[PDB]
């Protein structure tokens, strides 16, 4: 029975992180974006959640996470998004000491016009489609201008 810690997730955005959804502390880590030259159209990236409350997910019963890092793979051909791994971090922005549930299950899904990340994914793939590389500066401005 741990007490419930309320956090002050920073409203200031750390450089390199791009807000994915309007007024939500959910970001794409721009340094994570990668596409293999043998599998074009498949974008690998990490999404990062800054928490409002601490998550007690460490061996040490009193330590809590402040953020979540989710490794994902977006297929711009079919708009299938695969969730590969979820890790918990004790600092904001998916940094610091990590804790993870052991041996995790990958899970794919199809982004429909009524899906959450459909808007973001559409912006990511459109940006990627112009050069078969992501322009991080254009992506930030695209996601910012949409919001
Ligand atoms: Cl910064």
CA 14 to ligand 1 centroid distance, Å: 4
3-state secondary structure 73-115: EEECCCCEEEEEEEEEECCCCCCCCEECCCCCCCEEEECCCCC
CA 9, 10, 15, 17 dihedral sign is: positive
CA 7 to ligand 1 centroid distance, Å: 19
Instruction: Give φ, ψ of 89 to 5 degrees.
Output: -130, 145
Looking at the chain, after which residues does the C atom sit over 2.5 Å from the next written N, breaking the chain?
none
Q: Which CATH fold would you assign to the domain 1-147? A: Lipocalin (2.40.128)
Resolution (A): 1.9
CA 99 to ligand 1 centroid distance, Å: 24
CA 5 to ligand 1 centroid distance, Å: 25
CA 42 to ligand 1 centroid distance, Å: 28
CA 78 to ligand 1 centroid distance, Å: 35
First to last CA, the chain: 40
* Angstrom distances, CA of residue 30 to CA of 48, 56, 91, 100, 109: 11, 27, 18, 22, 22
Q: Report which secondary-structure segment, H or E, holds 57.
A: none
> What determination technique applies here?
X-ray
List the chain domain ranges: 1-147
């Amino acid at each position: 029975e741990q007490n419930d810690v309320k956090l002050a997730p920073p409203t200031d955005v750390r450089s390199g992180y791009i807000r994915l959804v309007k007024n939500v502390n959910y970001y794409i880590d721009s340094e994570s974006i990668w596409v293999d030259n043998q599998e074009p159209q498949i974008v690998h990236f990490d999404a990062v959640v800054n928490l409002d409350k601490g998550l007690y997910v460490y061996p040490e019963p009193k330590r809590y996470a402040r953020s979540v890092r989710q490794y994902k793979i977006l297929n711009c051909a079919n708009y299938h998004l695969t969730q590969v791994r979820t890790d918990f971090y004790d600092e904001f922005w998916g940094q610091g000491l990590r804790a993870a549930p052991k041996k995790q299950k990958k899970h794919t899904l199809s982004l429909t016009p009524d899906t959450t990340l459909y808007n973001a994914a559409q912006i990511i793939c459109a940006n990627y489609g112009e050069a078969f590389s992501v322009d991080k500066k254009k992506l930030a401005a695209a996601l910012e201008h949409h919001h």
